[PDB]
């Protein structure tokens, strides 16, 4: 709610934008353009890690007012994080939502977004710095000789029983799970609309947003059935033309019920159907037979052999128009249902019809880890360069890149697959890699690597046993001399059961602790030395 | 007709009433099997036949290009009912023969096998390219500017759009359909000859869906059919007319079997 703060917004600011993501230049780009408008000068941020943002806030080390970040917040109590916050204005306004209370109190420099159907923290600070024991509050914080406004010592005893027996619920609060929450800049799309605003490209910035991680096996949507009404209701309510559409640029954005298969649009059928993993894996494609039973599906609709290695873009028109006016009903009965979700599209002009989230998995592949030690800001620095309907040579590169990775991906999974290197090792599986790639040294393409190699052995080579149990990998970096990447990730089709492992690999660390890094605001990664992992696997096991 | 019908109708009781193979007999899911790839060449064994139904080799000399017609309207009466989408690649279907109890050497054939069902082989030798040809009579009238309708025989009716006129004509370069074609020149070996003379040879001709296939100096098998050139100028002759040869194409096996090959069993 800042309809009443957002007139305290004239003087100076910093806008700063924590870790990369889609969340965020969609957020932002917003933001920028918003404080432009009445006549303020203004600072975006790229972040590589906390680090670069102590030495970010050491590098404006000053006393501007308004500073804010967006989309992070849980990583210190940020009143001791940050000594020369005195009364200056913070703002957060993150969906990465289960962050310590010591961050919320101490109502001068932080601004409380908590609104949910979760009243569920309330004493929560209650006895942590408001008793203690072994240390005039008048509690277990002040003296505990029988002097605070069965024994004389029993004090304590209650007062660690309180502790303790809702440290149930403490323990149950950033030591069991993590996740998000809502919206990167939705609410900032409602807040921005009391202000007159019509910019449909707005409309398709927060469309990126959300079909980042409205990836309902990546991350949830929930709203996304309601939005389904909620955008709509924001749009098509409001409309400037009756009569008047049939015009060149920009004619008033649409919505549509159409799939998430990767590039229907830009490419050929048959090498399609075959990069993603929910078309893939239940039709077992990596071996011969998938092949064959594919191919009596490409029977039943009838569509020719040589057509499916034509570009759908370049096919002659009526199967082209006919195509999911066809799939949608003689595909739910051959075992794959639930590719078809919401979402939108619209062309600038007469060139091609983009896709409404084909930008994002040609984004994902604008992270270049290359050797030039220069390139993640620049690529950021691309990227929100790239979403308006100017710069658009590159999209297509991004295209081209982001396929003849997705094509790559494949190419180690049946590598790995049939040498059987899916290693148990306990109560978990577990997997181990050799050398670097330019492809998947960053961590997002190696969450990629493992949503396709976990649906593949786990959902085929066993009973019904161990078809729920997690993830892990390895990820080498001959970049910096070797220090051997690992990433946590979940087991399979529970949406609302998410991490464990926002800290659940902290138990080695408490164990024996080697080296152990989490530079990341992002939980659920680290990052370790080239070979001190073996000794620490064991420790890690449990 | 009544019998004359029964021809289609015992192929349609036989591919799925003849089994081999401990159940789901072959052509139950062979023509699929075609019809996925999109070959359009569908192949009949003759043993099958004699296993099923003997009656099919005294009616199949009379005129066998009527049986084979007989035998592609039930291809296409089956497969573009049963797989409606089909009817955009081809839309076209003709079957094969690879069965036959008699190898037939050459230097050994007359008169007596006229138009009838044969097996030869043999060795290529040099002949011509790849070529289309027509498949169908339309022309374009020229007094009224219509066309005359759609229709080695020649058949120009009077019936036409121009108030059934127009004797004159002429024609396009398109909306008439085509075929591809081929020639080959069969010599037989050098090895079952008769020991040093000279060969023998004929030309054979083979057609759209066999071509690409052949090659100069290779092994061979075919099961062909006798033609009769009709007329080399039948007048004042020589010491014999001006007459002449070919075999016509139905299927070819070849020996060598240069790619991924057999078919499976069941199990």
């Known amino acids: 709610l800042r309809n009443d703060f957002y007139?305290?917004?004239?003087?100076?600011?910093?806008?700063?934008?924590?870790?990369?993501?889609?969340?965020?230049?969609c957020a932002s780009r917003i933001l920028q353009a918003l404080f432009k408008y009445d006549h303020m000068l203004y600072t975006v941020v790229p972040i590589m890690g906390v680090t670069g943002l102590k030495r970010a806030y050491g590098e404006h080390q000053g006393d501007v007012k308004y500073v804010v970040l967006v989309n992070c917040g849980g990583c210190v109590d940020i009143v001791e994080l940050l000594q020369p916050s005195d009364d200056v204005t913070f703002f957060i306004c993150d969906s990465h939502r289960p962050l310590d209370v010591c961050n919320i109190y101490s109502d001068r420099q932080v601004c409380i977004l908590g609104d949910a159907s979760l009243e569920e923290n309330i004493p929560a600070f209650e006895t942590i710095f408001y008793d203690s024991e072994g240390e005039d509050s008048g509690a277990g914080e002040s003296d505990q000789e029988d002097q605070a406004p069965h024994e004389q010592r029993i004090?304590?005893?209650?007062?660690?029983?309180?502790?303790?027996?809702?440290?149930?619920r403490i323990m149950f609060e950033y030591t069991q799970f993590s996740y998000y929450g809502r919206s990167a800049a939705l609410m900032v799309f409602e807040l921005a609309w009391k202000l007159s605003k019509d910019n449909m490209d707005l409309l398709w910035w927060a469309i990126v947003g959300i079909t980042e991680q409205l990836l309902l096996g990546k991350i949830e949507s929930g709203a996304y059935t309601l939005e389904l009404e909620q955008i709509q209701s924001h749009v098509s309510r409001l409309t400037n033309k009756t009569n008047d559409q049939n015009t060149?640029?920009?004619?008033?954005?649409?919505?549509?019920?159409?799939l998430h298969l990767v590039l229907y649009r830009h490419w050929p059928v048959t090498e399609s159907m075959r990069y993603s993993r929910y078309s893939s894996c239940q039709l077992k494609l990596w071996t011969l037979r998938g092949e064959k039973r594919l191919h009596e599906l490409l029977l039943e609709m009838g569509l020719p052999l040589v057509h499916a290695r034509q570009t759908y873009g370049a096919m002659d028109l009526v199967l082209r128009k006919e195509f999911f006016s066809m799939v949608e009903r003689l595909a739910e009965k051959y075992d794959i249902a639930d590719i078809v979700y919401g979402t939108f599209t619209l062309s600038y002009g007469y060139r091609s019809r983009y896709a409404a989230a084909d930008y994002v998995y040609a984004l994902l592949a604008i992270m270049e880890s290359v050797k030039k030690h220069k390139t993640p800001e620049d690529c950021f620095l691309e990227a929100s360069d790239a979403?308006?309907?100017?710069?658009?040579?590159?999209?297509?590169?991004?295209?081209?890149?982001?396929?003849?990775?997705?094509?790559?991906?494949?190419?180690?999974?049946?590598?790995?697959?049939?040498?059987?290197?899916?290693?148990?090792?306990?109560?978990?599986?577990y997997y181990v890699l050799q050398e670097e790639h330019a492809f998947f040294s960053y961590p997002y393409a190696l969450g990629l690597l493992a949503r396709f190699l976990l649906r593949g052995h786990v959902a085929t080579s066993r009973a019904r046993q161990a078809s729920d149990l997690p993830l892990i990998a390895s990820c080498?970096?001959?970049?910096?001399?070797?220090?051997?990447?690992?990433?946590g990730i979940v087991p399979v089709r529970e949406?609302?059961?998410?991490?464990?492992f926002g800290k659940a690999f902290e138990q080695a660390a408490q164990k024996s602790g080697v080296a152990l890094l989490q530079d990341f605001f992002e939980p659920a990664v680290v990052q370790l030395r080239q070979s001190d992992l073996t000794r620490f696997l064991d420790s890690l096991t449990v | 007709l009544g019998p004359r019908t029964e021809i289609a109708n015992r192929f349609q009781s036989f591919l799925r009433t003849f089994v081999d193979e401990r159940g789901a007999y072959t052509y139950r899911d062979r023509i699929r099997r075609m019809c996925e790839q999109n070959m359009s060449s569908f192949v009949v064994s003759y043993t099958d036949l004699a296993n099923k139904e003997h009656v099919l080799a005294y009616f199949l000399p009379e005129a066998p290009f009527q049986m084979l017609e007989i035998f592609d309207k039930v291809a296409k009466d089956m497969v573009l009912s049963i797989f409606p989408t089909y009817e955009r690649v081809t839309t076209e279907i003709h079957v094969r023969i690879s069965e036959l109890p008699l190898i037939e050497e050459l230097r050994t054939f007359r008169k007596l096998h006229l138009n009838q069902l044969v097996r030869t082989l043999g060795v290529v030798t040099a002949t011509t390219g790849v070529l289309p040809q027509l498949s169908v009579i339309k022309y374009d009238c020229v007094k009224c500017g219509y066309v005359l309708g759609p229709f080695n025989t020649e058949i120009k009716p009077g019936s036409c759009?121009?108030?059934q006129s127009t004797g004159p004509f002429s024609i396009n370069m398109e909306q008439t359909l085509y075929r591809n074609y081929q020639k080959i020149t069969l010599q037989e070996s050098p090895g079952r000859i008769p020991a040093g003379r000279i060969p023998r040879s004929k030309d054979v001709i083979l057609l759209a869906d066999l071509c690409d296939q052949c090659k100069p100096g290779d092994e061979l098998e075919v099961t062909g059919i006798y033609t009769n050139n009709y007329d080399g100028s039948l007048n004042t002759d020589q010491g014999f007319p001006v007459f002449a040869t070919v075999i016509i194409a139905n299927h070819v096996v070849v020996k060598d079997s240069k790619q991924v090959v057999q078919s499976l069993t069941d199990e």
């Open chain 1, 495 to 500: 949406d609302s059961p998410r991490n464990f």
């Open chain 1, 248 to 258: 060149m640029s920009a004619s008033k954005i649409t919505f549509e019920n159409d």
């Open chain 1, 387 to 429: 979403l308006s309907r100017q710069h658009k040579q590159l999209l297509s590169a991004g295209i081209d890149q982001a396929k003849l990775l997705h094509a790559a991906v494949f190419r180690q999974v049946q590598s790995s697959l049939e040498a059987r290197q899916v290693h148990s090792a306990g109560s978990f599986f």
């Open chain 1, 7 to 25: 007139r305290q917004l004239v003087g100076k600011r910093i806008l700063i934008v924590v870790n990369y993501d889609i969340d965020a230049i």
């Open chain 2, 161 to 163: 759009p121009e108030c």
């Open chain 1, 476 to 487: 080498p970096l001959n970049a910096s001399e070797g220090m051997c990447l690992l990433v």
């Open chain 1, 155 to 168: 004090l304590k005893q209650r007062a660690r029983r309180q502790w303790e027996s809702e440290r149930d």
